[PDB]
């Protein structure tokens, strides 16, 4: 016996905190890469509050989508998440809330 | 002595759009090219929808467009279906899906 | 006395299809579509002008609202059409 | 390879906060793609808002307006 259920305490601890889960430097790099790929050739600057707000919104969206996908997983009669659950959740949420 | 819609080479009315913008309390001032731009965009969208509607009507040996043809034309296009995502057409029906 | 867009829709229909007619319910649906798009674009342009502390609505606000509201190729072609119309109207 | 900066433990933490118990291996690429699409949409809207004004720096209000225009309201950065 190594660890009976560490995931339980992990979830119980993560659902109580309110801090961001993704590192700041990789998120900033990815955002700047996408932004420079959108603009023609110009390199735009970024405020710190803008990146923080973007990260907050993205993480909230991902957590809610994971909740919906796990609802679909439990409906399908399983305990393991699959990509088809996320796809069907997006399809049922529709064109706007499902991207 | 000369219409503004003919000056811009359009079919949609320019003076009516300008008046509707002025009386809609959108802002205290309205420019001169905004109604022309808006009328051009509206006419382009109208023509884009009507061409596909006429094609869908012709593909059924019909000579008159009904709401069913508009529904087919709108739902068989990607960007048009994206634009009108929360709209219901009366007496339009659904698309045949297995 | 009421107002609608029937004459202009019929004109553009005769332009795109010379030998095709239209019913009355379809004309009502087209009127509703035109009114809806008008309201969307006008409201977006109004809030854009309000964000930047301006008291005028110009073709620049209309272009930005069109870019914000329509999908990719539709927005590109609509911007092209509007620019061509404004350029033709200015040279008169 | 900036998309690989979003590591597997971070996706694990997000799924655990969401309430997920078990995760398959093919989920991390799907999550990366979904995040990429979301970021592309929001950043396109924010860059449009930024370049409408004659600026070259993205601000927090631009991101807030871009999020609001899509049916999502953010309160902390008003």
């Amino acid at each position: 016996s190594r660890r009976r259920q560490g995931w339980l305490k992990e979830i119980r601890k993560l659902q109580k905190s309110t801090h961001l889960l993704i590192r700041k430097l990789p998120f900033s790099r990815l955002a700047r890469e996408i932004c420079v790929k959108f603009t023609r050739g110009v390199d735009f600057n970024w405020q710190a509050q803008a990146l923080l707000a973007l990260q907050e919104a993205a993480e909230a969206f991902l957590v809610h989508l994971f909740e919906d996908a796990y609802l679909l997983t439990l409906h399908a009669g399983r305990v393991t998440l699959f990509p088809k659950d996320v796809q069907l959740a997006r399809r049922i949420r529709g064109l706007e809330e499902g991207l | 002595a000369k219409s503004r819609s003919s000056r811009a080479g359009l079919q949609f009315p320019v003076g009516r759009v300008h008046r509707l913008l002025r009386k809609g309390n959108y802002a205290e001032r309205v420019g001169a090219g905004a109604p022309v731009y808006l009328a051009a965009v509206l006419e382009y969208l109208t023509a884009e929808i009507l061409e596909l509607a006429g094609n869908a009507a012709r593909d059924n040996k019909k000579t008159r467009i009904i709401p069913r043809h508009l529904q087919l034309a709108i739902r068989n296009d990607e960007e048009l279906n994206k634009l009108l995502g929360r709209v219901t057409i009366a007496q339009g029906g659904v698309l045949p899906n297995i | 006395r009421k107002e609608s867009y029937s004459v202009y829709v019929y004109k553009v229909l005769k332009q795109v299809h010379p030998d095709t007619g239209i019913s009355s319910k379809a004309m009502g649906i087209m009127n509703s579509f035109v009114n809806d798009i008008f309201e969307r674009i006008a409201g977006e342009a109004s809030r854009l002008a309000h964000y930047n502390k301006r008291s005028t609505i110009t073709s620049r606000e209309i272009q930005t609202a069109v870019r914000l509201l329509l999908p990719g190729e539709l927005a590109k072609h609509a911007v092209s059409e509007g620019t061509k119309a404004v350029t033709k109207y200015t040279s008169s | 390879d900036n998309i690989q900066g979003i590591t597997k433990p971070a996706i694990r933490r997000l799924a655990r906060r969401g309430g997920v118990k078990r995760i398959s291996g093919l989920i991390y690429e799907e999550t990366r793609g979904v995040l990429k699409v979301f970021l592309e949409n929001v950043i396109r809207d924010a860059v449009t808002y930024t370049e409408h004004a004659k600026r070259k720096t993205v601000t927090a209000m631009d991101v807030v307006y871009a999020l609001k225009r899509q049916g999502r309201t953010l309160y902390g950065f008003g």
Binding site: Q87, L95 | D77 | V16, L74, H77 | G33
Partner: peptide, 22 residues
Amino acid sequence: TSTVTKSRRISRRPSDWWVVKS
């Protein structure tokens, strides 16, 4: 299939937009 209307705007039919593809 698709349709090339006037102004050469390719009118495509919607597809599975809910699937992540590389």
